[PDB]
Amino acid sequence: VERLQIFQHLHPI
Amino acid sequence: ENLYFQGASLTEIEHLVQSVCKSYRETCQLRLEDLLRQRSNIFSREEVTGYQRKSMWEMWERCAHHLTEAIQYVVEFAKRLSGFMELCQNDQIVLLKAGAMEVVLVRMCRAYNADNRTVFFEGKYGGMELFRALGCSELISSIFDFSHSLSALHFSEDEIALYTALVLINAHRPGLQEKRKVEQLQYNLELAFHHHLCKTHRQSILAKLPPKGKLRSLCSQHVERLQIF
Amino acid sequence: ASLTEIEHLVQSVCKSYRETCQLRLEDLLRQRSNIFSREEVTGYQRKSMWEMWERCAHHLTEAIQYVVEFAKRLSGFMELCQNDQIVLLKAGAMEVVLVRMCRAYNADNRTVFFEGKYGGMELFRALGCSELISSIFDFSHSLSALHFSEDEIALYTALVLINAHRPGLQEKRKVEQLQYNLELAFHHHLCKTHRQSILAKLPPKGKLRSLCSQHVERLQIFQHLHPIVVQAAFPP
Ligand SMILES: O=C(Nc1ccc2c(c1)CN(S(=O)(=O)c1cccc(C(F)(F)F)c1)CCO2)c1c(F)cccc1Cl
Numbered sequence: 001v002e003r004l005q006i007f008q009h010l011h012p013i
Numbered sequence: 014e015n016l017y018f019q020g021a022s023l024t025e026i027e028h029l030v031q032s033v034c035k036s037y038r039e040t041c042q043l044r045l046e047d048l049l050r051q052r053s054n055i056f057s058r059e060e061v062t063g064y065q066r067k068s069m070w071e072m073w074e075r076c077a078h079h080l081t082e083a084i085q086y087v088v089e090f091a092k093r094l095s096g097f098m099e100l101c102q103n104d105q106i107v108l109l110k111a112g113a114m115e116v117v118l119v120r121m122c123r124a125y126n127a128d129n130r131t132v133f134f135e136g137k138y139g140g141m142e143l144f145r146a147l148g149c150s151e152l153i154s155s156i157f158d159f160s161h162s163l164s165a166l167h168f169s170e171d172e173i174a175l176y177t178a179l180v181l182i183n184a185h186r187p188g189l190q191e192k193r194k195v196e197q198l199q200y201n202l203e204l205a206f207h208h209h210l211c212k213t214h215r216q217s218i219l220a221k222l223p224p225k226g227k228l229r230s231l232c233s234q235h236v237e238r239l240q241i242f
Numbered sequence: 243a244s245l246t247e248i249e250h251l252v253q254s255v256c257k258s259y260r261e262t263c264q265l266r267l268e269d270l271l272r273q274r275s276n277i278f279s280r281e282e283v284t285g286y287q288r289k290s291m292w293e294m295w296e297r298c299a300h301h302l303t304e305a306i307q308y309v310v311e312f313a314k315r316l317s318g319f320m321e322l323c324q325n326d327q328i329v330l331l332k333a334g335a336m337e338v339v340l341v342r343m344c345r346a347y348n349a350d351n352r353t354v355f356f357e358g359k360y361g362g363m364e365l366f367r368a369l370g371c372s373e374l375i376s377s378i379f380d381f382s383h384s385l386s387a388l389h390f391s392e393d394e395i396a397l398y399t400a401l402v403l404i405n406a407h408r409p410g411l412q413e414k415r416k417v418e419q420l421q422y423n424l425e426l427a428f429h430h431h432l433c434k435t436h437r438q439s440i441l442a443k444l445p446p447k448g449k450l451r452s453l454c455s456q457h458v459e460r461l462q463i464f465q466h467l468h469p470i471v472v473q474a475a476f477p478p
């Protein structure tokens with residue numbers, strides 16, 4: 001998917 | 014950092030089953046009852062032509078939007094799994110980067126009708142001809158084939174919850190820092206899944222599950238085409 | 243870096259900002275007249291802290307998505323390793339949101355644009371975060387006095403993100419180079435627009451950082467009991 005997209009999914013805030 | 018980072022007893026295993034199934038119910042995005050109830054609501058020939066006339070750019074945006082949303086629900090499911098949020102951020106990213114899409118592809122069979130080979134898309138059911146503008150005929154066909162083969166298993170909600178928890182909780186993902194914690198979590202989920210299949214007399218599904226590499230290959234074929242768009 | 247390369251960096255940062263600003267300045271300014279009525283204010287005040295949290299956390303998730311999009315459009319950001327991209331955005335996205343807020347803030351009546359209209363900090367009573375809200379409104383009040391242009395915000399927020407002092411960076415030297423190029427671009431642009439005076443009027447680096455930390459502390463007590471799935475618009 002890509003590490004940033006995953007991070008953003010995990011931590012929207 | 015969690016009780017499932019070591020071997021759990023059978024009582025703890027039954028709690029893990031119930032919990033995984035609850036987490037799935039809360040994050041499934043579309044209710045199975047609603048999806049089955051909408052199998053009658055099929056796109057008209059005019060509506061299909063309407064989708065076919067759109068630019069590949071518009072179809073990409075609509076599809077990438079729906080895929081981002083599906084991934085978010087998978088991320089929410091992972092976060093509600095015991096021990097997942099006690100793993101380091103690195104390992105959480107590794108598991109979700111490697112498995113979220115694969116979970117999305119498994120969850121799709123719920124929104125798939127094997128009788129007319131249609132899928133639920135933007136409020137109604139339609140065949141693969143709906144996606145013509147994408148110019149991804151081979152990939153779309155493979156997605157529909159995989160969904161067709163999973164629908165034959167008559168996967169219950171709880172079987173999907175447990176199976177998709179194991180798609181994510183895989184200690185063989187390259188780049189894990191705390192592999193041993195993932196292994197412990199995985200071992201408990203595997204026994205939870207086998208134990209629940211024994212309780213429900215559903216041991217026959219294990220041999221019917223997609224082979225090693227099938228979900229992975231399809232997800233890689235998918236991410237290649239998405240890169241271009 | 244030559245005059246041409248610096249100027250291109252300015253134009254690019256300003257374009258990336260214009261494309262990701264979420265709410266147009268024209269729209270925000272023409273809606274300053276559209277103020278929440280006393281009945282509407284009471285309506286927000288009667289809501290549960292749980293209802294206000296979900297509405298606010300939704301708008302905050304959305305604001306952060308636009309900041310992430312801005313970072314991705316900045317030269318060299320994409321070329322940094324995923325680790326460094328996460329470190330910069332984890333540390334600075336929220337701080338950028340706090341800076342962008344001054345655009346939706348009217349210093350005349352001390353109101354902010356929220357859910358279609360302008361309202362004062364009393365709108366957020368149910369959150370029980372009156373000290374934090376007051377500090378957010380004070381920070382926005384102090385930035386609005388500077389009459390920050392869109393291009394000044396674009397360049398200043400690019401520097402909020404591109405900071406080589408963030409703990410955990412693997413390629414510190416690459417971030418340092420990117421930071422100086424943006425610093426050169428910002429100072430050059432301030433000299434072209436006769437705006438050299440704003441540098442000394444900018445909030446001290448520590449001010450945004452502490453406000454962000456105070457905000458994150460409160461946000462955590464809320465998301466601990468009430469998580470939410472909000473729809474994401476973008477990418478290309
Ligand atoms: O669409 C693509 N990828 C995708 C895969 C799984 C998904 C979703 C999107 C998201 N939604 S969906 O868009 O309503 C939907 C519903 C049913 C079938 C599809 C089908 F066939 F297109 F995959 C899509 C739920 C199902 O999970 C796609 C592609 F295949 C090729 C190129 C670019 C793109 Cl974006």
Ligand SMILES: O=C(Nc1ccc2c(c1)CN(S(=O)(=O)c1cccc(C(F)(F)F)c1)CCO2)c1c(F)cccc1Cl
Binds near residue numbers: 297303340
């Ligand atoms: O709401 C919180 N944090 C927040 C901060 C910046 C933001 C947004 C949210 C998102 N939106 S907003 O909700 O329309 C809005 C608009 C204007 C003012 C606010 C104000 F004052 F509340 F911060 C909010 C755009 C501005 O960027 C908040 C808090 F402060 C304390 C506890 C819990 C929470 Cl959730």
